[PDB]
Amino acid sequence: NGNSLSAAELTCGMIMCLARQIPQATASMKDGKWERKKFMGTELNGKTLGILGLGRIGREVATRMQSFGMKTIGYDPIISPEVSASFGVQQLPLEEIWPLCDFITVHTPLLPSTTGLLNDNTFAQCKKGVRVVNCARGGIVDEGALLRALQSGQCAGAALDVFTEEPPRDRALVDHENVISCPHLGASTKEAQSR
Amino acid sequence: NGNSLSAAELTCGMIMCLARQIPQATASMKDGKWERKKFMGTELNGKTLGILGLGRIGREVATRMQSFGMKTIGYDPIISPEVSASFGVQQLPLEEIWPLCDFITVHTPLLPSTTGLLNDNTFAQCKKGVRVVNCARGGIVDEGALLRALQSGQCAGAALDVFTEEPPRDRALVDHENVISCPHLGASTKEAQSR
Ligand SMILES: COc1ccc(NC(C)=O)cc1Cl
Ligand SMILES: COc1ccc(NC(C)=O)cc1Cl
């Protein structure tokens, strides 16, 4: 709420970092390397962002990313399609979302209906090379399915602020070259903290 | 031109990385650490961004960062205040800009008049803790001055896509904990490349 904009801003940051591989490029530089061809990027303008959860944080993510020329589509079981239209998000059924997205970001609570929302089945419905963000709750994205998608190239990269266990005991995801991550920094701004 | 958006998008990524230290957090995580207090961030909303150079790239930066609630001010000796007003940037004299800015980004050519535009003299006029981006041309920001400002804390962080020498022979800046960097990735998208 107070921290809605902090979360939204981190999520936008992560989307940009996935598009241009800034964290990996920084590490490359700090290891004394100059690897231009290796970190060839993607432009956000004209790409489709899928937003799962169209509450406050999801809406703020949407309007920011609209300024980059992203097409914003999304899903929410409560919010009406005419309401979401009013902040620029085209609502569709979940099955329609997967195959259109170049980027997917999650903004839901952790519920039975949202645990493993992204899983082996839904990654198989995505465009090859999809990039995924989770700055919401650990477990919305099934961690084993994500790892398998990254290993096959079905998923070209992921950004994670949250994990099923924190700090994460399993290291496979964190350690993957196409994964960027933070130690649950979503609310961690001076402004969010000091009301 | 074709690559204007690619550059503007990298710039905005770098601003978000400075605000939340995403590259440093990723490196922390990959080294098996979980360092939440270390990577306490700043919210962009309400902060002032100074844009030096209000051509196509600077303007695209401005409208993206306006969506985050940044106040956008800037300087350009050639663009008229009425043109810049049309994309939401308050033009001011250079001497007025420095003290106001939480973030400064440069979007000029490399000319005698822009070489060391940010130097010991102009860092001294900045707000303590200013964060600086250069995704334009190596040398606009004086590299020794930038290093001195980082070491004193006058500058809280810097994002560099470009360097006076490429790759940079001097390593002090790259190696600093508060410097994020890329090997000149501004135009390196599939879209900029493949017209
Ligand atoms: C299955 O997807 C969902 C389930 C629940 C919510 N939101 C709340 C507050 O319950 C959002 C989504 Cl997208
Ligand atoms: C004194 O600073 C400048 C000098 C020149 C330019 N731009 C061009 C196109 O010449 C911009 C600045 Cl900010």
Numbering used by the authors:
A (entry chain A), B (entry chain B): 100 to 294
Could you give the paper's own sentences about this structure?
Human 3-phosphoglycerate dehydrogenase (PHGDH) is responsible for the NAD+-dependent conversion of 3-phosphoglycerate (3-PG) to phosphohydroxypyruvate (PHP), which is the first step in the de novo serine synthesis pathway. Thus, PHGDH activity diverts glycolytic flux into biomass production. Limited proteolysis with thermolysin revealed a stable fragment of PHGDH consisting of the core of the catalytic domain containing the cofactor-binding site, and this was shown to crystallise readily.
PHGDH-93 was then successfully crystallised with an empty, accessible cofactor-binding pocket. All of the fragments for which crystallographic data were obtained bound to the adenine-pocket suggesting this pocket to be a preferential site for fragment binding. Analysis of the fragments’ binding modes showed that four of the fragments (5, 14, 15 and 16) were coordinated by hydrogen and/or halogen bonds, whereas the other three fragments (3, 9 and 10) appeared to be stabilised only by apolar contacts. The most potent compound according to the ITC data, fragment 5, bound more deeply in the adenine binding pocket compared to the other two structurally similar fragments, and formed an halogen bond with the backbone carbonyl of Gly151 through its chloro atom and a hydrogen bond with the side-chain of Ser211. Fragment 15 formed a similar halogen bond interaction with Gly151 through a chloro-substituent. Fragment 14 was substantially less potent (Kd = 26 ± 31 mM) compared to the two structurally similar fragments 5 and 15 (5, Kd = 1.6 ± 0.2 mM and 15, Kd = 2.8 ± 1.6 mM).
